[PDB]
Amino acid sequence: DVTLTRFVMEEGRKARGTGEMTQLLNSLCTAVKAISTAVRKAGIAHLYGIAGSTNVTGDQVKKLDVLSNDLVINVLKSSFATCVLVSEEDKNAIIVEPEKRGKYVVCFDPLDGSSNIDCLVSIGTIFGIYRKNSTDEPSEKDALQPGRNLVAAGYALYGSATMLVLAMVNGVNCFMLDPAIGEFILVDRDVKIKKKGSIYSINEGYAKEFDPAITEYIQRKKFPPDNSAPYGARYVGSMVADVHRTLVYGGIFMYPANKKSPKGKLRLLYECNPMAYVMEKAGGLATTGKEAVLDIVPTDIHQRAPIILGSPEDVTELLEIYQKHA
Amino acid sequence: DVTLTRFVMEEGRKARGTGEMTQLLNSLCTAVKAISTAVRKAGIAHLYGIAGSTNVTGDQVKKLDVLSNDLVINVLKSSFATCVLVSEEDKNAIIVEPEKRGKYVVCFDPLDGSSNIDCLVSIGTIFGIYRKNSTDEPSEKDALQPGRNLVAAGYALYGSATMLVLAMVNGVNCFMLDPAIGEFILVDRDVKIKKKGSIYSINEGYAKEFDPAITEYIQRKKFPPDNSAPYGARYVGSMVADVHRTLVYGGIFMYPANKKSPKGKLRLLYECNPMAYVMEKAGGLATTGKEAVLDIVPTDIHQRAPIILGSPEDVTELLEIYQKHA
Amino acid sequence: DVTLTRFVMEEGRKARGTGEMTQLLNSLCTAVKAISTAVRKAGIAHLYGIAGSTNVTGDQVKKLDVLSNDLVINVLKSSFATCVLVSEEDKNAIIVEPEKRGKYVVCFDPLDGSSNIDCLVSIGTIFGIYRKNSTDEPSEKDALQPGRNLVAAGYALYGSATMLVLAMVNGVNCFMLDPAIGEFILVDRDVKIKKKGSIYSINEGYAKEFDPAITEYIQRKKFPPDNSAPYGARYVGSMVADVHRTLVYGGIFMYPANKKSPKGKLRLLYECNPMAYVMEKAGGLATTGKEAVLDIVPTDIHQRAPIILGSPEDVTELLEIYQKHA
Amino acid sequence: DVTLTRFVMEEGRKARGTGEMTQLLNSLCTAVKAISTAVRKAGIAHLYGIAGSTNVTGDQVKKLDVLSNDLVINVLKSSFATCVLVSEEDKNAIIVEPEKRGKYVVCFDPLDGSSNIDCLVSIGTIFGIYRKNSTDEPSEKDALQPGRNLVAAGYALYGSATMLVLAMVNGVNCFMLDPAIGEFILVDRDVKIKKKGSIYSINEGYAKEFDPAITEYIQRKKFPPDNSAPYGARYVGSMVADVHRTLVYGGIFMYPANKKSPKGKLRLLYECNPMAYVMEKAGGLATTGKEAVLDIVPTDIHQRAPIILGSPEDVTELLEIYQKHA
């Protein structure tokens, strides 16, 4: 009975605001619905395949990457609530024209889970929202803030159902898209992650490159020293999907640094920070294995960061291993 | 431009038939669309949660399990094309009333991927269709046929998009549900799996219970003896999703027997056989590690069977390991 | 709980048939759903406007006319149940290719209510189905049968909701399109028109050209000689809409001959006959004012015919006036 | 490419506002989408039939009347933009609770075209928005303002497609609901009615009770004194549908006073004023036959008013007749 718009408006009225966050989120929701509709019939629309370009990270851009990126950029611009936009698919930050300029800075991953698009596995959209602090003209530097400065973050999950997970200062709430009326309805309030889970999520195909800590941790999940039941393994392959499951089922999700990648694979501004924020607001933890993800001060809008997140007791157990090896 | 109905009708006209297979599939498609619609808004409809019962396999029945089961049973009965139905959610085979009795026997998994329902990860519906051979009245024995006797098999995948994958004697074809008109449109014709993939899919949380062959194979995927790139790992957790990815991306999917489960976990009649059939029609292989899944003569409608399937070169590599250890 | 497919299949099984009528109707339903979806968002799709051509009747062809015509022609051809097609938008009858040739002849109005398209008023699709009687090759003559030879007829109404009204030998049934699953669900069984209504439907803008009978009848509806309540007037402007209301509310619908049009405006094969058939199966009447519409033997596939239809007592009252003036 | 939200926000930013009008309209749009979805499948949902009550006007309340009323009342309350609500289905004005109280007063007809619901003919929702002028606590008197005080007005038309027609100080714009993404998209900008049309819309079943002016006018439309082509007649029966057609095709719509009804049938606050406002903003006229509808100062929230509206030359022609008879 409660839409995302209604929820955000009331929450914003309690925080004494102008209403552009509601404007920003309402706009973001429109793009998310458009992306969801395209995704649900991508094959019919011939939306699978490459776009013929590579982004800064080196990823081969896909058709849905371009569509989603264009949709998000346009709705945020027209929202009159943003001034600086950072996207995985754009080399440099996008500065909104003076006329439609707002007070928020948005970092987003238009379409997360690239490798899972063609096999119809869950994909999504990730976003992190900051308030412009500076007084000078808007620039890329405005997006180089540590995650702990986020005022809102979340993601749209295009899975069996489309879910918009939104985290703000007071907590995390899940809204499900009702395809019939095109509205996101609140379905899970003040979500909190279990203190300890029973699922570990990591691509073990990188075993040869894992550091001693990750290696020891995985071995521990498979062969509990206390004869407890081994953890079950789950790795969908799309960060949004694995992280969402971690949030609602508990457990741990890992994309750590490895011999070949000092800073892991996932991008700090639009993948790691948003999810770290959602996790901490849900009572979970998010670390690189040596420091809290949200405390990292970025120097590159496309910089990568190792990330280990989920239930506090699980993340802590891994942190102790990193400490032990240090 | 080609619907599943049109495809099946023409293919059936070439095989000189009465048309009940088209009737059966048309009916199945209606249930699949109903399940898809419910799944896409399950949270809004309060469809997440347990049903308050356990099936023969011992699974805790979920709300979507009951809904999907009822929908499939009703449409198949009214199809006038079936005589015996076997469902994961029903203790004994369902014998269709004389009046609406057809010539086909259908084994199905109304909702596959139970553990993934609540976290919105891909789930689906699996089916295997047989032609009644006996001349006597229809009974459970009519469903106890080896998979190689299947005349049609496939699955509906409720992922980022809803796909109906259908395999018949001539090959495998993928049809995507167009939400706007409620029709499955052909999007992938005569699908063939790659001879060798680069993804292995298995729940490694069972490492402590794996046999020496599975153990050696996994280690080989992580540390290629020829210094080739290690395989990537993917395990969505829903058989339909992992198998579909295996079909379109290549690679291998495994749910082998282990120290605790002599016959693995997956069910032969409505999970293993249908997927084994799809795989073989796509040029892939499906084995228990010691024998072809489709050649097993079942004695229990709910019996389990180990299953290793996917690209022929990958499955063969594992088979050689089993042989080596034998 | 009962789909149109299920209804037609069972009704056909009682009539001992091959099943192509079910095939024909299933195919027609697919086109109807496609037309409905396009219509519901025609403005967004830029589907309003002229096509740049005029048909035999002299109507200015519209974009939706072409789209609907193409959809209906293609699905009927691929149905494998038709041999001759007659459309308002095609100069000559369309002979189905030998390979996909069936036993039925279909006369249809792909999009009825042309003048109401742009103002978003109800429009629809009308069809009449005949069984080929001849033994020789299929030709236009096969469509020149009197309406009383119809085996099925009806219409799709794209109004506040999309309804498929189907009339066959046993009666008239209404099925509503469920947008969520793309299936027509039975909502009104064995529909029967009221013996006498209280609504008269006619374009009175033609008053100057009406014959004495129509003139006297209208005056009688406005000034009842028995001081009864005057009839209410309703004229949506789309035959499908006015006729549907006549069916479910009772009353009379008129598009009579006039000084300028000896045979009225509406077309016999794809407008008048189908509606006359629906009406008679519902216990209503359909006359030109001098003879039953269904008994007219056509000589032109695009010939026009005056038509007065609806509740038997109302139509009879008008018939007596025509008789009185004769 | 432009949504109603985007349009209203920009238009409001030009008028220097707080943004609650955008909030109000966004909220209204949500209710309209919910009503549209229910209407499009009303038969399936068993939404046809009476509710078991009668409103102040004496109308037999229908199921869709209650549903639509509840939806509109709830979204407007939660909008935080209204203080007083007037509905056809509510005996007295509804005063919004202090906490969610806004500055606007809204008069609405939750579901217009009652008699057309069951025959699936076009129906809709009509609304008129005023700014609270008083300084004292909100009361029914706040809704008793002349229509010329309206700041916004329009209607949702649930016809072949769902259209939201919005009129504000700068003009009239049409937005069509895209069922796929649940967003109203601008499809007709700055709509202007033709100076003179060729369609007259009135229920001639009331001929016995019409005044001499209406009687002479109709006769003139049928028998032009200058031998011009007679006007065509159209009377859908739902004010929203007939008025919309009048807007986009031109012509005249009439529901005048008659011997039995001194003030006609239509209600001033939620039917006549909104449509009169839309008409005048489109360059049309709206009169009772003796005075402009928008200048009437209401004394009863449910008072009726005669209404004649449409193309200026047509309305003027009728006005001259009223003058001539006066």
Ligand SMILES: O=P(O)(O)OC[C@H]1O[C@](O)(CO)[C@@H](O)[C@@H]1O
């Ligand atoms: O194939 P890998 O190396 O496990 O990478 C998977 C990761 O790639 C991403 O698609 C980012 O490129 C994430 O969504 C996902 O977590």
Ligand SMILES: O=P(O)(O)OC[C@H]1O[C@](O)(CO)[C@@H](O)[C@@H]1O
């Ligand atoms: O959690 P586990 O043991 O990996 O089981 C996963 C399997 O369970 C199933 O849901 C069957 O119960 C399959 O769909 C899936 O492959």
Ligand SMILES: O=P(O)(O)OC[C@H]1O[C@](O)(CO)[C@@H](O)[C@@H]1O
């Ligand atoms: O405008 P007129 O002459 O009343 O014609 C209306 C008729 O035109 C049609 O569109 C056929 O051309 C019918 O659907 C409708 O009954």
Ligand SMILES: O=P(O)(O)OC[C@H]1O[C@](O)(CO)[C@@H](O)[C@@H]1O
């Ligand atoms: O049946 P009548 O008297 O022509 O009334 C029709 C009018 O009734 C209404 O439904 C209002 O009650 C309007 O929408 C429509 O214009």
Ligand SMILES: [Zn+2]
């Ligand atoms: Zn990427």
Ligand SMILES: [Zn+2]
């Ligand atoms: Zn990503």
Ligand SMILES: [Zn+2]
């Ligand atoms: Zn991305």
Ligand SMILES: [Zn+2]
């Ligand atoms: Zn189960």
Ligand SMILES: [Zn+2]
């Ligand atoms: Zn299963």
Ligand SMILES: [Zn+2]
């Ligand atoms: Zn199951």
Ligand SMILES: [Zn+2]
């Ligand atoms: Zn025409």
Ligand SMILES: [Zn+2]
């Ligand atoms: Zn027509």
Ligand SMILES: [Zn+2]
């Ligand atoms: Zn037509």
Ligand SMILES: [Zn+2]
């Ligand atoms: Zn009413």
Ligand SMILES: [Zn+2]
């Ligand atoms: Zn009304």
Ligand SMILES: [Zn+2]
């Ligand atoms: Zn009303």
